[PDB]
């Protein structure tokens, strides 16, 4: 029933709308152009092509990520650098969401899996990291279930509705 494909420009309107509706961190319109145009942002859509009334190709889940030079990342302190391999990169998950009526079916887990499977194919890509809002227990349980390590708490990381919230840094290293 559920399939995964790269996000493309025809997803632009739906992508912006779903972020506004379910993703707490606000992004500017330029961000969504970056996502659908690719380049330094990789992303995946989840679709149910079995949906009635024409919306078969409309995404019902998404994950967006960007590529980060390992030595420019905030977790560079956690990495053992081997002089012979070069600096390497990291994949940083930016956003992740599933529409409410599709939740608790493993779609978010599968979306994260796509990002990890992607990062493992890039020669010197060292893994995946992200920040989770600290009071978002479902997200914490999800990344833990995917074997991500909860590293540390960052204070005042997020600004949401004019209120500051802490985040947790989560990392999955390909060779931990």
Ligand X SMILES: CC(=O)SCCNC(=O)CCNC(=O)[C@H](O)C(C)(C)COP(=O)(O)OP(=O)(O)OC[C@H]1O[C@@H](n2cnc3c(N)ncnc32)[C@H](O)[C@@H]1OP(=O)(O)O
Contact status, residue 36 vs residue 15, Cβ threshold 8 Å = yes
The one among 7, 65, 96, 169 contacting ligand X by CB under 6 A: 96
Stretch that binds ligand X, among 65-73, 74-82, 98-106, 114-122 (CB under 6 A): 98-106
Stretch that binds ligand X, among 29-37, 50-58, 64-72, 90-98 (CB under 6 A): 90-98
Q: Report whether 66 belongs to an annotated binding site.
A: no
At 27 the three-state DSSP class reads: coil
- CA–CA gap between residue 66 and residue 48 (Å, rounded): 25
Contact status, residue 145 vs residue 109, Cβ threshold 8 Å = yes
Return the residue matching tokens 């909860």. 150
Sheet hosting strand 41-48, strand order edge to edge: 2-6, 41-48, 59-69, 89-98, 125-133, 163-173, 149-160
The reply to whether 146 sits near ligand X by the rule CB under 6 A is no
Q: State the minimum distance, in angstroms, from the CB of residue 63 to ligand X.
A: 9
Q: Interface residues for ligand X in 115-144 (CB under 6 A)? A: 132-133, 136, 138-139, 141-142
HSE (side-chain half, CA atoms, 13 Å) at 59: 30
The one among 2, 16, 67, 103 contacting ligand X by CB under 6 A: 103
Residues that bind ligand X (CB under 6 A): 22-23, 96-98, 103-109, 132-133, 136, 138-139, 141-142
Binding site as annotated, residues for acetyl-CoA = 96, 98, 104-106, 108-109, 133, 136, 141, 145
């Amino acid at each position: 029933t559920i399939c995964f494909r790269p996000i493309n420009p025809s997803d632009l309107e739906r992508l912006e709308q779903i972020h506004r509706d379910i993703f707490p961190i606000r992004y500017e319109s330029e961000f969504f152009q970056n996502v659908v145009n690719g380049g330094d942002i990789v992303s995946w859509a989840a679709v149910d092509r079995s949906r009635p009334d024409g919306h078969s190709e409309e995404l019902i889940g998404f994950v967006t990520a960007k590529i980060v030079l390992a030595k420019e990342s905030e977790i560079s302190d956690l990495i053992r650098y081997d002089s012979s391999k070069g600096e390497g990169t990291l994949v940083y998950i930016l956003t992740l969401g599933v529409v409410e009526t599709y939740r608790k079916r493993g779609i978010a887990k599968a979306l994260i899996n796509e990002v990890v499977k992607y990062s493992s194919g890039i020669p010197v890509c060292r893994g995946v990291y992200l920040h989770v809002i600290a009071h978002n227990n479902p997200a914490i349980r999800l990344y833990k279930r995917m074997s991500f390590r909860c590293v540390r708490r960052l204070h005042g990381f997020y600004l949401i509705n004019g209120q500051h919230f802490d985040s947790y840094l989560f990392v999955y290293f390909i060779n931990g």
